[PDB]
């Protein structure tokens, strides 16, 4: 039922869980004690580039979904690349990761080939957070609490100006 904590996410039965269970699966911590964390950074209002209409629908959908999967969701809006970095650094230091088995990172903004655009981005003065930086801030060195634990990064953004298509005759 949708009235529960899992919402619209189809539940895994105990018979299904044993059917999957092998030594090639990530371990899941006890539901009673675990403190799962997730972070959504969504840029909607920008200084130079047009407003991202419908971003609130994405925030709602992603926030609810990750909560349904058992993650406590922090939502941060309209940040620069420097502010995103600071927020990522703060997220990596959260003590709850030690009593968590995994994490989800969601980035939603305008994007170019180099990376994700901050709120202050323009072609004159770039304000870009690179994917490489996200990985570095969340790796074993900078985030030892999530060692051996799945780190899922989701990015909604353009990666260039091209339509991504070619023509062919049938």
């Amino acid at each position: 039922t949708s009235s529960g904590s899992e919402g619209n996410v189809k539940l895994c039965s105990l018979e299904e869980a044993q059917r999957i269970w092998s030594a090639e699966i990530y371990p899941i911590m006890d539901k009673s004690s675990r403190t799962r964390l997730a972070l959504i950074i969504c840029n909607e209002e920008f200084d130079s580039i047009p407003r991202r209409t419908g971003a609130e629908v994405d925030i709602t959908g992603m926030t609810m979904l990750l909560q349904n999967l058992g993650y406590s969701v922090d939502v941060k809006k309209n940040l620069t690349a420097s502010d995103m970095t600071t927020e990522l650094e703060a997220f990596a230091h959260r003590p709850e990761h030690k009593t968590s088995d995994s994490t989800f990172l969601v980035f939603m903004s305008h994007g170019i080939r180099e990376g994700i655009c901050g709120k202050k981005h323009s072609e004159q003065v770039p304000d870009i957070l690179q994917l490489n930086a996200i990985f570095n801030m969340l790796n074993t060195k900078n985030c030892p609490s999530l060692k051996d634990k799945p780190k899922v990064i989701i990015i909604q953004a353009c990666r260039g100006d091209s339509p991504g298509v070619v023509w062919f005759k049938d």
């Binding site: 899992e6 619209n8 996410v9 189809k10 539940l11 895994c12 039965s13 299904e16 869980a17 999957i20 092998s22 090639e24 699966i25 990530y26 899941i28 539901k31 991202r52 209409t53 419908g54 971003a55 629908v57 994405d58 959908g61 992603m62 979904l65 349904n68 999967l69 058992g70 995994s102 939603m108 994007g111 080939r113 994917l131 990985f135 969340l138 790796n139 074993t140 060195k141 999530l146 060692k147 051996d148 634990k149 799945p150 780190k151 899922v152 990064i153 989701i154 990015i155 909604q156 953004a157 353009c158 990666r159 260039g160 100006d161 091209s162 339509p163 991504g164 298509v165």
Partner: protein, 88 residues
């Protein structure tokens, strides 16, 4: 006693499109990739691992229309299958 560990491991990234290419967003319905990901996660989290769910999202984008995109899995260092086990 100290032990060595891989600096980068157990990562998976899922991007809305391929490099150089645009990603689409409906002004009222939201981002196509985001809506599609939620739909597939809601349906397949119970039975499929995260990598397989992402593959399914990719397949749903296979037939290109007027506004096409191909989501991409990137920089994968998952050594095991990540099952969400929803409800548990």
């Amino acid at each position: 006693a100290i032990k060595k560990a891989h600096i980068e491991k157990d990562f998976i990234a899922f991007c809305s499109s391929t490099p150089d290419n645009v990603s689409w967003r409906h002004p009222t319905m939201g981002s196509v990739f985001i809506g599609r990901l939620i739909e597939h996660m809601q349906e397949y989290a119970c039975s499929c691992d995260v990598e397989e769910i992402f593959r399914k999202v990719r397949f749903s984008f296979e037939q290109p229309d007027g506004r096409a995109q191909m989501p991409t899995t990137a920089r994968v260092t998952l050594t095991r299958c990540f099952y969400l086990f929803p409800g548990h």
